[PDB]
């Protein structure tokens, strides 16, 4: 009812900051945001990997599901992850000057198959004062600051726990270099 009004206001707030060369939002990592289909309760977003992280200078797509009691409860958010077959089919249609996105997300707090982000991350931080923008920013932060406390990817979390930085970086670089395509 009125939750739609709030969601719309937040969306417009993000759109305003986006269509502009230097609002601060450009250094937060938010690249795009829009309704998934024709409703205000499912969203598609695009974010950039934060500077000085192994994820830097690469784009990822996100899907966001909004609860009915919003903003009493946080949004559920996942990375868009495709199968190797699909990705390779997408790569044969690509252009050498298009917008390319990586469709695999190797990260301690992300399910490598489904793309799901651990509910802990947002549940521990979220409050009714938060917005969609702050959630996106929170995920960009998460890319630079994983918490090995709540792992969905064992190998990455352990690499981090053993402080094997080089292998971590090399793995992320590998998936960025091999599993990216247009759109």
UniProtKB/Swiss-Prot annotation:
EC number(s) per entry: 2.3.2.23
Molecular functions per Gene Ontology: ATP binding; ubiquitin conjugating enzyme activity; ubiquitin-protein transferase activity
Cysteine disulfide partners in this protein: none
The keyword Flavoprotein is assigned to this record: no
InterPro entries: Ub_conjugating_enzyme, UBQ-conjugat_E2_core, UBQ-conjugating_AS, UBQ-conjugating_enzyme/RWD
Matching SUPFAM superfamilies: UBC-like
Chemical reaction(s) catalysed: S-ubiquitinyl-[E1 ubiquitin-activating enzyme]-L-cysteine + [E2 ubiquitin-conjugating enzyme]-L-cysteine = [E1 ubiquitin-activating enzyme]-L-cysteine + S-ubiquitinyl-[E2 ubiquitin-conjugating enzyme]-L-cysteine
SMART domains assigned: UBCc (SM00212)
Name used for this protein in its record: Ubiquitin-conjugating enzyme E2-21 kDa
Originating species: Pichia angusta (Yeast)
């Amino acid at each position: 009812a009125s939750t739609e009004k709030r969601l719309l206001k937040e969306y417009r707030a993000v759109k305003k900051e986006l269509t502009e060369k230097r609002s601060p939002i450009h250094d937060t990592g938010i690249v795009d945001l829009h309704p998934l289909e024709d409703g205000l309760f499912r969203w598609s977003a695009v974010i950039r990997g934060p500077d000085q992280s192994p994820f830097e200078d690469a784009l990822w797509k996100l899907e966001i599901d909004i609860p009915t009691n919003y903003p009493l409860d946080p949004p559920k958010i996942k990375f868009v992850v495709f199968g190797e077959e699909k990705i390779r089919q997408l790569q044969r249609k690509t252009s050498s000057g298009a917008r390319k996105v990586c469709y695999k997300m190797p990260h301690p707090n992300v399910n490598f198959k489904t793309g799901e982000i651990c509910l802990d991350i947002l549940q521990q931080k979220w409050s009714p004062a938060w917005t969609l923008q702050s959630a996106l920013v929170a995920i960009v932060v998460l890319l630079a600051n994983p918490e090995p406390l709540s792992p969905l990817n064992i190998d990455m979390a352990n690499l981090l726990k053993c402080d094997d930085t080089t292998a971590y970086k090399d793995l992320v670089h590998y998936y960025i270099a091999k599993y990216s395509a247009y759109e």
